[PDB]
Amino acid sequence: GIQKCGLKVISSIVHFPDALGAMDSVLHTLQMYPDDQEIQCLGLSLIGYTGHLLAKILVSSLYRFKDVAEIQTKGFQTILAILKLSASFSKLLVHHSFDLVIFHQMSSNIMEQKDQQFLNLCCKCFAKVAMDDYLKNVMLERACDQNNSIMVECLLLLGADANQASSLICQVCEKESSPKLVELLLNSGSREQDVRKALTISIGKGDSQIISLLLRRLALDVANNSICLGGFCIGKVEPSWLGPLFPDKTSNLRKQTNIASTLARMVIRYQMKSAVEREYITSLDLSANELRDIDALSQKCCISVHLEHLEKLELHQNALTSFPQQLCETLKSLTHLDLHSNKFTSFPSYLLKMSCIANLD
């Protein structure tokens, strides 16, 4: 019990010149006393300069409470000092637990608070670990394993190979994720084959939101005003997927947040300073998707008003059996309809009721 007041005496003597080991002693006490000793563990100066247990004890002490204002800033100053002593400390740091505490503190409403000096030290530590970009890829993998889209954008902006690894996008899409995260991964470069595998995955675990997010990248060309879903082997088709693909002119542009970009700008500055020191869609290709019916297109969710302006519908090389009559009257502006290589048995006469049909196949 006397170790508490003993550490008080220790804090008194460290100010004297040539205090030199006492590092092993205080480490054993910190492992013994979690709360009180760690409150004064800021006295830990540059000592010992290689035991990973010491760094593990440091990070575990920071994370065990993670809600006391002073120990966070004190511990951040301590870890900043030791990484300046040795760059190899950064490797083991991000290896053990650095993400679990860093993401937690920077996402727990770190903004909108008068902690400018606090954020400055955290960004200084960020710019310090930003070196050896392989570590950044590790941080990205860990930041995607959890559902924290607030900091993934920062990692991408600092420069991270999103095609590093079962690639990243398939991992994110396999587990339940947020639309913001998959969007940020698609906007950054990612191999087309990886995106295709991710579409198959999200087809299995039916989720309209992620399906539309991917199809807006694979099979949409805004210049031509055409959906190009040709050969994706989407065994079915739902109007809730093609919904956001169509323009839906009611939608607008709004910057929801900017904290990530500004955070990225200041860590880049700190790294640089440390180095110095109408128009509807008129086509819908559904060919070769191994369909078996299109009955799911009837009084559709916001897709009915958009099909009225379709001027082409490629449905060839599928396996259909009929053409839904309700769709025939909804498609009030077709000119080119393609139905060849399907499996039909009798000509649907009502196909010739379409208002402007001009090329039937």
Partner 1 sequence: KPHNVLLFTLYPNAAIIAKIADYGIGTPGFRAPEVARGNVIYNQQADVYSFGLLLYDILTTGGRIVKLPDPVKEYGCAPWPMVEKLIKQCLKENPQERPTSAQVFDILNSAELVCLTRRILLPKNVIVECMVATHHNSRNASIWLGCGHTDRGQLSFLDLNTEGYTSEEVADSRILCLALVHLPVEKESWIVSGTQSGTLLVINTEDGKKRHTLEKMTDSVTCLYCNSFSKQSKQKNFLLVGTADGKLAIFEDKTVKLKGAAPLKILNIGNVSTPLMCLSESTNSTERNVMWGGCGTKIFSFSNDFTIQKLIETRTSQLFSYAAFSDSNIITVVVDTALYIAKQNSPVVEVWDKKTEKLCGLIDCVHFLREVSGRVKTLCLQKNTALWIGTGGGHILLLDLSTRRLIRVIYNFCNSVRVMMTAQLGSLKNVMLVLGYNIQSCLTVWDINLPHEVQNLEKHIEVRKELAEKMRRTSVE
Distance CA 226, CA 229 (A): 9
User: Are 172 and 185 within 8 A, CB to CB?
Assistant: yes
The number of beta carbons lying within 10 Å of the beta carbon of residue 2 is: 6
Helix ranges (DSSP H) in 308-352: 325-330
Helix (H, G, I), strand (E, B) or coil at 83: helix
Using the minimum distance from each CB to partner 1, give the nearer residue, 119 or 157. 157
Q: In angstroms, what is the minimal distance from the CB of 355 to partner 1? A: 27
Report the distance separating Cα 297 and Cα 37, nearest Å.
Answer: 66
Helices (H) and strands (E) in the chain, counts: 18, 6
**What is the C-alpha to C-alpha distance for residues 10 and 8, in angstroms, rounded to an integer?**
5
- Gap between the Cα atoms of 186 and 208, Å rounded: 16
Q: Toward partner 1, which CB reaches closer, 27 or 264?
A: 264
Which CB atom, from 120 or from 187, has the smaller least distance to partner 1?
187
Nearer to partner 1, 7 or 268 (CB): 268
d(CA 3, CA 36): 10
**HSE (CB half, 13 Å, CA atoms) of 185?**
32
How far apart (Å, rounded) are the C-alpha atoms in residues 257 and 121? 23
Q: 201 near 173, Cβ under 8 Å?
A: yes
Q: Are the C-beta atoms of 318 and 289 separated by less than 8 Å?
A: yes
Shortest Å distance, C-beta 201 to partner 1: 20
Helix (H) or strand (E) holding 220: strand 220-221
Radius of gyration of the chain (CA): 29
Rounded Cα gap, residues 335 and 10, in angstroms: 87
Smaller CB separation from partner 1, 313 or 354: 313
Smallest distance, partner 1 to C-beta of residue 312, A: 12
Q: Each residue of 230-242: b (16+ CB within 10 Å) or e?
A: eebebeebbbbbb
Name the site residues for partner 1 (rule: CB under 8 A).
Answer: 157, 189, 191-192, 219, 221, 223-224, 228, 230-231, 253, 261, 264-265
- Output 78 or 188, the one with its CB closest to partner 1: 188
CB of 88 to partner 1, least distance (A): 30
Closest approach of Cβ 361 to partner 1, in Å?
17
Rounded least distance, CB 309 to partner 1, Å: 17
Does residue 80 contact residue 125 with C-beta atoms inside 8 Å?
yes
**Closer residue to partner 1 (CB): 191 or 353:** 191
DSSP string across 258-294: -HHHHHHHHHHHHHHHHHH-------EE-TTS-----
Residue with smaller CB distance to partner 1, 95 or 196: 196
* Closest distance to partner 1 from the beta carbon of 192 (Å): 5
Smaller CB separation from partner 1, 108 or 256: 256
- Give the nearest distance from C-beta 27 to partner 1 in angstroms: 42
Query: Shortest approach of partner 1 to residue 229 CB, angstroms?
Result: 10
